[PDB]
PDB file of C-alpha atoms and ligand atoms in Angstrom:
ATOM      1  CA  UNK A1210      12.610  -2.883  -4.929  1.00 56.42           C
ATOM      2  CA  UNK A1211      13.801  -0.041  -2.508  1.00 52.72           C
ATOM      3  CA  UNK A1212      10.684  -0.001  -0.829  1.00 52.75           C
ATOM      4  CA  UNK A1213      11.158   2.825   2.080  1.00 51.85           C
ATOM      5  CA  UNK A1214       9.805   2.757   5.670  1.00 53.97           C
ATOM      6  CA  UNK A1215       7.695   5.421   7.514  1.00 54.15           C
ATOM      7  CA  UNK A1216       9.908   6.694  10.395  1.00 53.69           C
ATOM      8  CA  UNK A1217       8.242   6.063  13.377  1.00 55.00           C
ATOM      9  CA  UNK A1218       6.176   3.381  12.420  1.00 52.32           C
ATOM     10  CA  UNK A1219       2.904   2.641  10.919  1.00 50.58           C
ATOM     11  CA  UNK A1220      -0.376   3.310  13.401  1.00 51.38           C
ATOM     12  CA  UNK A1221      -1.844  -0.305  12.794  1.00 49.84           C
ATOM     13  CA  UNK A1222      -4.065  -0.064  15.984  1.00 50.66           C
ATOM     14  CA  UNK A1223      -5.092   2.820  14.356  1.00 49.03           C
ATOM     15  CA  UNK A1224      -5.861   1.135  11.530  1.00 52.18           C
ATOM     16  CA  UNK A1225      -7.371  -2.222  13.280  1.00 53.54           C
ATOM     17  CA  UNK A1226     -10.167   0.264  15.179  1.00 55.22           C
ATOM     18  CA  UNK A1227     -10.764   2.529  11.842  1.00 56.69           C
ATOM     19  CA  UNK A1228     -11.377  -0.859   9.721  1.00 53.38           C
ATOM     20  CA  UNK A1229     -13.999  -2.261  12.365  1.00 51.45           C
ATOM     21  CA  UNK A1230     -15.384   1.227  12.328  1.00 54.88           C
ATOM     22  CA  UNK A1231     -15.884   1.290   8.783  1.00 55.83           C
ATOM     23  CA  UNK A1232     -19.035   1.966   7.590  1.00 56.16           C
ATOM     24  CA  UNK A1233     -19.805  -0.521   4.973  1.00 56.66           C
ATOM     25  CA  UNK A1234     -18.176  -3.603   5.632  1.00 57.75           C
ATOM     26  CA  UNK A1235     -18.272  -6.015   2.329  1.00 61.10           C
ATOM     27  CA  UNK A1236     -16.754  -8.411   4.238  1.00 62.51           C
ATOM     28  CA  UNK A1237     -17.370  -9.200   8.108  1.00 62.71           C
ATOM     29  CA  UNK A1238     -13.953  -9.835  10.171  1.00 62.43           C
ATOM     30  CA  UNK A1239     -15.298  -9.647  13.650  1.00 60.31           C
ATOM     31  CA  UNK A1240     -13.028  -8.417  16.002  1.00 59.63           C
ATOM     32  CA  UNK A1241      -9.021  -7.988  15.094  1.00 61.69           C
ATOM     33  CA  UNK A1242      -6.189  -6.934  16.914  1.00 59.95           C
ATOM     34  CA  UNK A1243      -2.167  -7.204  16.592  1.00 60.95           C
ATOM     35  CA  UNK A1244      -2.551 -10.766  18.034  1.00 62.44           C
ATOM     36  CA  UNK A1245      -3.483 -12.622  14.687  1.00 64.30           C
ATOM     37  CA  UNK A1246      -1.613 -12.582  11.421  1.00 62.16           C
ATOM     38  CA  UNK A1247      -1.477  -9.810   9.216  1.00 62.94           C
ATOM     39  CA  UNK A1248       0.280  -7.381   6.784  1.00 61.13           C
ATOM     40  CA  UNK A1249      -0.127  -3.435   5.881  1.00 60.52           C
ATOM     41  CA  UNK A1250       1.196  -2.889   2.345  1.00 61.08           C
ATOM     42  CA  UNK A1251       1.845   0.622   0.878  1.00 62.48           C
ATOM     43  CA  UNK A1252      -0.848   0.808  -2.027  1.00 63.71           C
ATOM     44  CA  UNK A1253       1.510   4.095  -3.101  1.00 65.98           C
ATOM     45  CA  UNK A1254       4.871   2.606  -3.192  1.00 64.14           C
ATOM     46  CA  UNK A1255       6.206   0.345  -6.606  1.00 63.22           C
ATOM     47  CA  UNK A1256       4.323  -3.094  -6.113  1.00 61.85           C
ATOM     48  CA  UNK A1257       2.299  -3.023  -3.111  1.00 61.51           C
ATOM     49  CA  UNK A1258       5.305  -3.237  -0.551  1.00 61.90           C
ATOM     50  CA  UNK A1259       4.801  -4.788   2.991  1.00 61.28           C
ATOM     51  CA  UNK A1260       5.483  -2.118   4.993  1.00 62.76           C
ATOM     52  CA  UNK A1261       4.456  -3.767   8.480  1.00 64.95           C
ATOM     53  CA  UNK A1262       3.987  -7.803   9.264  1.00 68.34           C
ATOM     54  CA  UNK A1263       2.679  -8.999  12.944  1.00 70.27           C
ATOM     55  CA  UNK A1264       4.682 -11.656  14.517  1.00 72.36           C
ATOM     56  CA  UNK A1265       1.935 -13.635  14.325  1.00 71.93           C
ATOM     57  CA  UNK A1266       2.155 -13.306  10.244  1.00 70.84           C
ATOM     58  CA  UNK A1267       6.179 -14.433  10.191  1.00 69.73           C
ATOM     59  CA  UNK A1268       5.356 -17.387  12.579  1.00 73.17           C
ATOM     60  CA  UNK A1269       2.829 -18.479  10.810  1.00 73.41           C
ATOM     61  CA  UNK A1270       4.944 -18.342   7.929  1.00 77.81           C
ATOM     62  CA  UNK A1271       8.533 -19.234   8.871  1.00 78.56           C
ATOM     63  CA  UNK A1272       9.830 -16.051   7.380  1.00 78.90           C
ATOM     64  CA  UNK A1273      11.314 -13.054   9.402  1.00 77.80           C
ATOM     65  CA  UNK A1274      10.894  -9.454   9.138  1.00 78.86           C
ATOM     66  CA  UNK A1275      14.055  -8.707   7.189  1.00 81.02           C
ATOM     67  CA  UNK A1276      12.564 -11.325   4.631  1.00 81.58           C
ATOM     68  CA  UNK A1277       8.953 -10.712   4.554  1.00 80.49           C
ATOM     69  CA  UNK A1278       9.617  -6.383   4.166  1.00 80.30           C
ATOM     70  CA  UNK A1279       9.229  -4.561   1.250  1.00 81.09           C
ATOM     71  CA  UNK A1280       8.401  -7.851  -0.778  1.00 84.03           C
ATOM     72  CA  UNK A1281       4.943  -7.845  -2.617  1.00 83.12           C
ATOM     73  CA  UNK A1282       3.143 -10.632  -0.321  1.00 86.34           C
ATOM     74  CA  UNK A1283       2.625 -12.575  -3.580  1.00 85.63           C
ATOM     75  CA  UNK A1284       6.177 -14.421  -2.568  1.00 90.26           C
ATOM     76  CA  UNK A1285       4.739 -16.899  -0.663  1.00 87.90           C
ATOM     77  CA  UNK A1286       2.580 -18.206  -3.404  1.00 86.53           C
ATOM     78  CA  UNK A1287       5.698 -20.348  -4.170  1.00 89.86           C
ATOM     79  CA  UNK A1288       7.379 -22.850  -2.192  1.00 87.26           C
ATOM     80  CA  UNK A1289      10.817 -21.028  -2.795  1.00 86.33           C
ATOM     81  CA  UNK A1290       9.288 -17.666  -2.429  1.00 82.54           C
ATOM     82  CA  UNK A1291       9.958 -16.773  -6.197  1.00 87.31           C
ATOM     83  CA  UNK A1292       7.144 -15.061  -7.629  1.00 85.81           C
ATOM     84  CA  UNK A1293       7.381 -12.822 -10.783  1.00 86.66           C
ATOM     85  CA  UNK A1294       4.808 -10.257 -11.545  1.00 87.09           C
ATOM     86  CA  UNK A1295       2.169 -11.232 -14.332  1.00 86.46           C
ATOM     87  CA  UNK A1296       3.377 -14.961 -13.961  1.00 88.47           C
ATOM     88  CA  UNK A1297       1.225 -18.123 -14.639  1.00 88.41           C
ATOM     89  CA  UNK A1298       1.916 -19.580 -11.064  1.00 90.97           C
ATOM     90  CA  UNK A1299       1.887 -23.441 -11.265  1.00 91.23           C
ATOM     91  CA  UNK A1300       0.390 -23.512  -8.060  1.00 90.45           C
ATOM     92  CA  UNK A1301      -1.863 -21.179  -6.889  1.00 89.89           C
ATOM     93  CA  UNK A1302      -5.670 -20.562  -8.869  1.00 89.75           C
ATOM     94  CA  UNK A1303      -4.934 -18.034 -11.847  1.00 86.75           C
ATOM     95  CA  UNK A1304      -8.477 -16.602 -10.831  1.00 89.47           C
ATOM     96  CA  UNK A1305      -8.015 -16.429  -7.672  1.00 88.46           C
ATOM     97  CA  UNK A1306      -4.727 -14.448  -8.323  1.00 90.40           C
ATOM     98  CA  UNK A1307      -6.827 -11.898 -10.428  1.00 90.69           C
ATOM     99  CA  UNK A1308      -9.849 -11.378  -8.186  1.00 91.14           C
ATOM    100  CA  UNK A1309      -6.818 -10.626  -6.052  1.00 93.96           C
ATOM    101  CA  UNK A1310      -5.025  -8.318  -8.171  1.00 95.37           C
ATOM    102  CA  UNK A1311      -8.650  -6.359  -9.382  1.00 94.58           C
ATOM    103  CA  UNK A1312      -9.865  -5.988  -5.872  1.00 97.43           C
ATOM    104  CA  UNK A1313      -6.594  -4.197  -4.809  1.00100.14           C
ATOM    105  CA  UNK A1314      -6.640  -2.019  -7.759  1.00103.00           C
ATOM    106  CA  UNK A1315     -10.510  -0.953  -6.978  1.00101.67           C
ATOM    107  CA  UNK A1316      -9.556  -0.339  -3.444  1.00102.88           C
ATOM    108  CA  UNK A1317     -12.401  -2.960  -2.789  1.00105.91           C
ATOM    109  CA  UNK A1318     -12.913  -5.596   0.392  1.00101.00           C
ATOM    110  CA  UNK A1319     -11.872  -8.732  -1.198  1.00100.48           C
ATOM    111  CA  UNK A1320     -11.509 -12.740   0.760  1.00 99.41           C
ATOM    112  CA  UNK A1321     -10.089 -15.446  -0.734  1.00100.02           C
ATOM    113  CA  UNK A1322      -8.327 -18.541  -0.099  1.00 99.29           C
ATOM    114  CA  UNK A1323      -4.804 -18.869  -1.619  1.00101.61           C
ATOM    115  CA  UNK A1324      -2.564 -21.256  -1.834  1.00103.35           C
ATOM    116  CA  UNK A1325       0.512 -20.259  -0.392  1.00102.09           C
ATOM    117  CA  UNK A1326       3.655 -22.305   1.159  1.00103.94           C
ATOM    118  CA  UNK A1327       5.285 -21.239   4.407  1.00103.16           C
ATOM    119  CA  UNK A1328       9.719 -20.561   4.527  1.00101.25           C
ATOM    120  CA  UNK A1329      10.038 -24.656   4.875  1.00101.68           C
ATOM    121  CA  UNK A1330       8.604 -24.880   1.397  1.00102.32           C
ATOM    122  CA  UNK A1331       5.104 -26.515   3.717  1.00102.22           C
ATOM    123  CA  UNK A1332       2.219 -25.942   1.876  1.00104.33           C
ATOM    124  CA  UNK A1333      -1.353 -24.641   2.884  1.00108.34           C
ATOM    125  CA  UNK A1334      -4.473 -23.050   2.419  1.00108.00           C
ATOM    126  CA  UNK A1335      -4.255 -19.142   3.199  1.00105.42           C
ATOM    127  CA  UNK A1336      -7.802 -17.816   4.243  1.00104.92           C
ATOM    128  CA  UNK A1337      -6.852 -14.239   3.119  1.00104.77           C
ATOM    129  CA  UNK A1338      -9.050 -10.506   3.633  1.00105.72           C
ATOM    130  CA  UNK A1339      -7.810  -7.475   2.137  1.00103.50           C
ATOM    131  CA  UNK A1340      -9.083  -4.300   3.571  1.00102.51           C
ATOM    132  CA  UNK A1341      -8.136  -1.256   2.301  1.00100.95           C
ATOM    133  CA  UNK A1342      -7.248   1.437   4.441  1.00103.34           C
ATOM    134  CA  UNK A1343      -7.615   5.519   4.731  1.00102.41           C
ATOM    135  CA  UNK A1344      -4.311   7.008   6.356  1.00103.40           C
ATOM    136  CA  UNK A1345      -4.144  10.261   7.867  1.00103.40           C
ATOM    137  CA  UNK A1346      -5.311  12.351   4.460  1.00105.50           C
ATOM    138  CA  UNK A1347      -8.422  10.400   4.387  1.00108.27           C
ATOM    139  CA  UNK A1348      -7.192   8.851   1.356  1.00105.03           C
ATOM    140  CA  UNK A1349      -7.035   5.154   0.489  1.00103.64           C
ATOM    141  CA  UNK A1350      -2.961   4.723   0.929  1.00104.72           C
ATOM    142  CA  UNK A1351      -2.725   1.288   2.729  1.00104.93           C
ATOM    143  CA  UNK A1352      -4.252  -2.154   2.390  1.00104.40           C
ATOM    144  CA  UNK A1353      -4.150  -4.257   5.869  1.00102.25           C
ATOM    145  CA  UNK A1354      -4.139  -8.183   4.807  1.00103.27           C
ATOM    146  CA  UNK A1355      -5.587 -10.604   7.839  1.00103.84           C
ATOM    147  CA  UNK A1356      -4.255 -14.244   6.971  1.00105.98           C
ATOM    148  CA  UNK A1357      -5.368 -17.344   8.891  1.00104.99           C
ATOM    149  CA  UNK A1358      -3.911 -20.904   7.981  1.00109.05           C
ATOM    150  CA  UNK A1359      -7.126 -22.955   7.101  1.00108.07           C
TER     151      UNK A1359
HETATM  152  C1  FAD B2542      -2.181  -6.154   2.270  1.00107.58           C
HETATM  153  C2  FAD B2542      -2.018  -7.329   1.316  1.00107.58           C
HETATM  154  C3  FAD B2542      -1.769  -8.580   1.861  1.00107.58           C
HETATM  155  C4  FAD B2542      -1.609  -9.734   1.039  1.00107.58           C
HETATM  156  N1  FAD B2542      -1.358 -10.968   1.628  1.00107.58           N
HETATM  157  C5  FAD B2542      -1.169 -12.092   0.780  1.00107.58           C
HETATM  158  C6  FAD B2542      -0.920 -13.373   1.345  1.00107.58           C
HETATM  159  O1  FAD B2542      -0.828 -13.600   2.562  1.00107.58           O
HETATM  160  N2  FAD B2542      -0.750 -14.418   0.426  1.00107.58           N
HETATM  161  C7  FAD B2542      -0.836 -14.273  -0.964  1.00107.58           C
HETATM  162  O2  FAD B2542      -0.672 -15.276  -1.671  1.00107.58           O
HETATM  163  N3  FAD B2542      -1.094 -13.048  -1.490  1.00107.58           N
HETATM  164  C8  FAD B2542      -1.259 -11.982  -0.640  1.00107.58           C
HETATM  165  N4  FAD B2542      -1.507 -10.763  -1.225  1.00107.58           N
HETATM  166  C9  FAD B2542      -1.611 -10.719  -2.700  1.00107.58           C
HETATM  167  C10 FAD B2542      -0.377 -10.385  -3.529  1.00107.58           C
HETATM  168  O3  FAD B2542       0.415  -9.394  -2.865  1.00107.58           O
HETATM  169  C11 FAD B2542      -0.845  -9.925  -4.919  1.00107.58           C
HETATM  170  O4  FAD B2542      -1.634  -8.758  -4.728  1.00107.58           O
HETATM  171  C12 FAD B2542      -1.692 -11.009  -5.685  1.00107.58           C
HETATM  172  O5  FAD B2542      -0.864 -12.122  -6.001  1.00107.58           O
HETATM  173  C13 FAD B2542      -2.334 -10.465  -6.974  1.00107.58           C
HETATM  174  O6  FAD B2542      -1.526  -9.427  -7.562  1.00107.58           O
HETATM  175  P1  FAD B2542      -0.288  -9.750  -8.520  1.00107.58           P
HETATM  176  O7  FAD B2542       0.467  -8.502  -8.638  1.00107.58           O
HETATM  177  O8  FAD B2542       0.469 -10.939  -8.000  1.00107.58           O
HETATM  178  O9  FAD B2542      -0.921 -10.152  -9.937  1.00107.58           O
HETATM  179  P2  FAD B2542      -0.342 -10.803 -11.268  1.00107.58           P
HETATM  180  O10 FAD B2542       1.093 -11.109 -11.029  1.00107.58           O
HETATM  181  O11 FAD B2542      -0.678  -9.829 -12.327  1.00107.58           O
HETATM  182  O12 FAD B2542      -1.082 -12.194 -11.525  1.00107.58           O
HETATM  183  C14 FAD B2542      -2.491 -12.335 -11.832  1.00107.58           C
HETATM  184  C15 FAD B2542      -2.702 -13.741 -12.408  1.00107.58           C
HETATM  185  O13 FAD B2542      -4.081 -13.857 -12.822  1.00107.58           O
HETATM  186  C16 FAD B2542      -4.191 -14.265 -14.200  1.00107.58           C
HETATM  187  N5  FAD B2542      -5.141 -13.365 -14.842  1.00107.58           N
HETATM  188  C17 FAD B2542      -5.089 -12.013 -14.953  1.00107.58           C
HETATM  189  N6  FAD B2542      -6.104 -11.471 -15.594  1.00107.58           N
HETATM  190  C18 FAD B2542      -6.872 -12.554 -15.938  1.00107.58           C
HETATM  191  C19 FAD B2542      -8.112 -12.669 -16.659  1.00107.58           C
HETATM  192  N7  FAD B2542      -8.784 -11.604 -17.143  1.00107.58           N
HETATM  193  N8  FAD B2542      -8.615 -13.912 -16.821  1.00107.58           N
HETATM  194  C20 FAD B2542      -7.917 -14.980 -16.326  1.00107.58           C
HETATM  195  N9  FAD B2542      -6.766 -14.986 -15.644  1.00107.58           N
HETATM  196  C21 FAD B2542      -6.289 -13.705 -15.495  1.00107.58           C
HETATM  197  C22 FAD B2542      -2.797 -14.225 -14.810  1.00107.58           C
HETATM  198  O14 FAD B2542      -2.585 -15.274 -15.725  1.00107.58           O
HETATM  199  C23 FAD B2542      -1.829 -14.092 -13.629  1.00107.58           C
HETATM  200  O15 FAD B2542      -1.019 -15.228 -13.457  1.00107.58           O
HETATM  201  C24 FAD B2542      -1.669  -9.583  -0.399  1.00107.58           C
HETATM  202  C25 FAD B2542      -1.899  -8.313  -0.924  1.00107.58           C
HETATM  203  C26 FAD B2542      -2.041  -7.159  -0.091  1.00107.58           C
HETATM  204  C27 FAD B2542      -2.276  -5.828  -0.764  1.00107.58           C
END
């Protein structure tokens, strides 16, 4: 994947303030910031890349930034990080996966819980919120993922 970076960054404050703006919340967050763990992946770029990761999002899951960028997040669905696309994981809920993968695709508020397994190969419950995410076009282009070890 030769995902490619924005230049100058990605304006996830920005982002945090326009996604407790929103309108029509299908899903209630409550207050975020840059503190907690989270992800912006580039809904135009091959696979959903992760384009941005906080700190909190590589401590909480043992990988860095050089390993956790341009990946699809599905990677930490498995305890070695190998995850092909369309594959029957052997851990993680196949429904789960899909609600996942539709909600994305629609551009639709989704929350689930996923089981996912941090750089060590240590497993646990991901309590995970998609929120997709206008950029300066007005267009959908980003999705911002919060993730909170249950
Ligand atoms: C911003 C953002 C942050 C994210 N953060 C995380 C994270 O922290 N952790 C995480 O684990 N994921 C995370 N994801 C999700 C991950 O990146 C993928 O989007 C997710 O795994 C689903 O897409 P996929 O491409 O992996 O689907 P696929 O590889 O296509 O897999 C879908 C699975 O569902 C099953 N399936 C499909 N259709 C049906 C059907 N009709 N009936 C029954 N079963 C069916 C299949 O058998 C398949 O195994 C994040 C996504 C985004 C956009």
């Amino acid at each position: 994947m030769h995902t490619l970076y924005a230049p100058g960054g990605y304006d996830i404050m920005g982002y945090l303030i326009q996604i407790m703006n929103r309108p029509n919340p299908q899903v209630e967050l409550g207050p975020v910031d840059t503190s907690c763990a989270l992800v912006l992946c580039d809904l135009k770029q091959k696979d959903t890349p992760i384009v941005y990761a906080s700190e909190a999002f590589l401590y909480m899951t043992g990988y860095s930034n050089a390993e956790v960028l341009g990946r699809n997040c599905r990677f930490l669905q498995s305890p070695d990080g190998m995850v092909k696309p369309k594959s029957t994981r052997k851990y993680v809920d196949s429904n789960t996966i899909n609600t996942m993968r539709k909600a994305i695709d629609r551009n639709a508020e989704v929350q689930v819980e996923v089981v996912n397994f941090k750089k060590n190969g240590q497993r646990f419950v991901n309590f995970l919120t998609m929120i997709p995410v206008r950029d300066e076009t007005g267009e959908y282009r980003y999705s911002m993922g919060f993730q909170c070890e249950t």
